[PDB]
Structures are given as C-alpha cells and as structure tokens.
C-alpha cells in the first residue's frame, strides 16, 4: 500500500541545460535543487548518477 507519494517539479540548472541537454542530448539522473529553503537532492532508482 502507498502511504504517501511526494511529487515535485524541480528545475534543471543552467549548467545542465547547456552542458548536458543542449550539448550531449542527455540529462542527469540526479535532481539537485532548492526547495523550501533547503538543498534537496534526488537520485533516480536510488542509484548512482548517470
């Protein structure tokens, strides 16, 4: 049973839009952003950055 599903929309930083998405066509598997005055990081599948 789901006891909770926190869904959020994080921005993609400038250094990822240009260096990753626009340059290589890829996106990082980690979302590092600022939410509620706090540095929050999320790892996809709780795995390493890819």
Q: For binding to another protein (CB under 8 A), which residues are involved?
A: 32, 36, 38-41
Closer of 12 and 18 to another protein (Cβ): 12
The span from the CA of 23 to the CA of 45, in Å, is 25
Closer of 20 and 43 to another protein (Cβ): 43
Three-state DSSP at 20 gives helix
Closer of 40 and 50 to another protein (Cβ): 40
């Amino acid at each position: 049973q789901f006891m909770g599903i926190f869904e959020d929309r994080a921005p993609v930083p400038f250094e990822e839009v240009i260096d990753k998405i626009n340059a290589k066509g890829v996106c990082r598997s980690t979302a590092k952003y600022v939410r509620n005055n706090m540095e929050t990081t999320a790892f996809h599948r709780d795995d390493h950055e890819t």
